[PDB]
Amino acid sequence: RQWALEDFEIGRPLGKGKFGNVYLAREKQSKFILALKVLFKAQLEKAGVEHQLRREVEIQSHLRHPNILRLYGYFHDATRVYLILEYAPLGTVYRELQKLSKFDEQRTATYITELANALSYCHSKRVIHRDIKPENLLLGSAGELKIADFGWSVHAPSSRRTTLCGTLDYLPPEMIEGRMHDEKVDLWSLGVLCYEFLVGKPPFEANTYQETYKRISRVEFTFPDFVTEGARDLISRLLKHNPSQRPMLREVLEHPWITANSS
Ligand SMILES: CN1CCN(c2ccc(C(=O)Nc3n[nH]c4cn(C(=O)Cc5cccs5)cc34)cc2)CC1
Numbered sequence: 001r002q003w004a005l006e007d008f009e010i011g012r013p014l015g016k017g018k019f020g021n022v023y024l025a026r027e028k029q030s031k032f033i034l035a036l037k038v039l040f041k042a043q044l045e046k047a048g049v050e051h052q053l054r055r056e057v058e059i060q061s062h063l064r065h066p067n068i069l070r071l072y073g074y075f076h077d078a079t080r081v082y083l084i085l086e087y088a089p090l091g092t093v094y095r096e097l098q099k100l101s102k103f104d105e106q107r108t109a110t111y112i113t114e115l116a117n118a119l120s121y122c123h124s125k126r127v128i129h130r131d132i133k134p135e136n137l138l139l140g141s142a143g144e145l146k147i148a149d150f151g152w153s154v155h156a157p158s159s160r161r162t163t164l165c166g167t168l169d170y171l172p173p174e175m176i177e178g179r180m181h182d183e184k185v186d187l188w189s190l191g192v193l194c195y196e197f198l199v200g201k202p203p204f205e206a207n208t209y210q211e212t213y214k215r216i217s218r219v220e221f222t223f224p225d226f227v228t229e230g231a232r233d234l235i236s237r238l239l240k241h242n243p244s245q246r247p248m249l250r251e252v253l254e255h256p257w258i259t260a261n262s263s
Pocket residue numbers: 014015022035037085086087088089090091092135136137138148149154155
């Protein structure tokens with residue numbers, strides 16, 4: 001089906017980014033509520049990522065999983081590229097985290113299960129190394145997690161330090177120490193994410209980025225007294241310096257703390 005701008009009506013902005021914006025939208029015929037991400041070819045070419053957009057939209061286009069925000073279609077014109085995306089009505093996990101300061105164990109274990117399931121699916125399709133920070137996670141109508149780390153910034157919502165290798169807070173030891181990485185980086189990210197969910201802040205925070213790099217290399221992090229032994233065991237396992245010793249996603253999904261707290 002060849003979509004066109006004429007097929008949609010655009011509503012309020014859901015986000016503003018460097019490459020473009022994202023709006024609430026409705027498809028003329030079905031009257032279905034979606035999200036329309038609008039990217040400007042000008043900024044795309046300026047960054048020499050024009051061809052890379054279509055290639056990335058191609059792989060994402062075929063990823064169908066309940067915890068991965070669906071990318072339905074795409075069309076373009078002389079100056080803009082339009083991405084038709086599933087609408088997640090409850091917003092970002094990040095905003096929920098700010099509102100509550102931290103998540104309880106049941107909510108956290110549930111999100112971890114959903115992310116582990118989605119990652120499992122992606123890894124099987126050879127899709128790896130994702131930016132799974134709270135700001136890139138949306139929530140469905142039932143509160144289910146929707147991974148939306150397609151990239152191509154069209155929103156904020158924070159000033160967390162990022163690098164060409166990824167979000168600094170989430171960078172694994174291998175990337176900081178100059179070694180080549182593999183899909184095991186996603187397990188480390190899952191450990192950092194779980195920690196942030198339960199604590200409200202990243203485990204390697206420091207007075208300077210230089211010191212953060214050092215603490216990641218030494219896997220130097222501690223927990224607040226309120227985190228339980230079950231959570232500590234899973235996170236400690238995920239945050240192992242040796243990539244190969246981090247648990248398999250199957251082992252995460254079957255971890256005692258996860259099975260006991262995940263809905
Ligand atoms: C109590 N609440 C407060 C705020 N509320 C919403 C605030 C924001 C949203 C929202 O962004 N929804 C989206 N749905 N599909 C998308 C593709 N998006 C991006 O590509 C842009 C991205 C943003 C993050 C990752 S990718 C973004 C969306 C929904 C509700 C309503 C009621």
